[PDB]
Amino acid sequence: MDPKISEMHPALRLVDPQIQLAVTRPKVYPIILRLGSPLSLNMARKTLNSLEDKAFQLTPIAVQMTKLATTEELPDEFVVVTVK
Amino acid sequence: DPKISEMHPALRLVDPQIQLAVTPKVYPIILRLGSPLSLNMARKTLNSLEDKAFQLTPIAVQMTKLATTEELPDEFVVVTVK
């Protein structure tokens, strides 16, 4: 039990709404992280569709995150991903 | 370098019922878990003047360790946990 949402342990962060979780049920949810550890995101694509010479390219994506000031900033529905 | 089947953390494909929406392109997720991750759906079930309550419901999502690169989709995101 933490004194406020901007100061939780581990930190609570909203992920930039440019990245959300899609669930087929497809509905899109904001992601709240509980950051028990860092994580990273890479976009990947198979560039050659070829059994004998298969190639993938990856690009790291910087994930902007927001600290919340009050529980008014928590949406009505969202997912929580708890790391570590 | 090792085959898909030799890497730690293992590459896990997440149930494609759960994908990452990026801006609305949606992407299958590959997880590499140095540490455990959990996923909960949250719903505010109460908002009075006094207090808020959120119901959290675990999603135990199906994952598969990949053994061949052929199991990899044409496009996907990789989420690596430290």
UniProtKB/Swiss-Prot annotation, chain A:
The record makes one more remark, namely: The open reading frame (ORF) encoding for this protein overlaps with the N ORF.
Q: What is stated as this protein's family in its record?
A: Belongs to the coronavirus group 2 protein 9b family.
Tell me the outcome of changing S40E.
Answer: Complete loss of binding to host TOMM70
Provide the species name: Severe acute respiratory syndrome coronavirus 2 (2019-nCoV)
Q: Which GO terms describe its cellular component?
A: host cell mitochondrion; mitochondrial membrane; outer mitochondrial membrane protein complex
One family name in Pfam for this protein: bCoV_lipid_BD
User: What is the name of the protein in this document?
Assistant: ORF9b protein
Which consequence is recorded for altering T47A?
In strain: Delta/B.1.617.2
Q: Name one GO molecular function term.
A: identical protein binding
Q: Where in the cell is it found?
A: Host cytoplasm; Host mitochondrion
Question: What is this protein for, i.e. what is its function?
Answer: Plays a role in inhibiting the host innate immune response by targeting the mitochondrial-associated innate immune response. Acts by binding to host TOMM70, inhibiting its binding to HSP90AB1 thereby disrupting the interferon activation pathway.
Give residue ranges for domain 9b.
8-84
Give the GO biological process terms: negative regulation of defense response to virus; negative regulation of mitochondrial fission; positive regulation of autophagosome assembly; symbiont-mediated suppression of host cytoplasmic pattern recognition receptor signaling pathway via inhibition of MAVS activity; symbiont-mediated suppression of host type I interferon-mediated signaling pathway
Which terms are listed as keywords in the entry?
Answer: Host cytoplasm, Host mitochondrion, Host-virus interaction, Inhibition of host innate immune response by virus, Inhibition of host MAVS by virus, Inhibition of host RLR pathway by virus, Viral immunoevasion
Q: What is annotated about its quaternary structure and interactions?
A: Homodimer. Interacts with host TOMM70; the interaction occurs only with monomer.
The short sequence motif called Nuclear export signal sits at 32-40
Q: What is its main location?
A: host cell
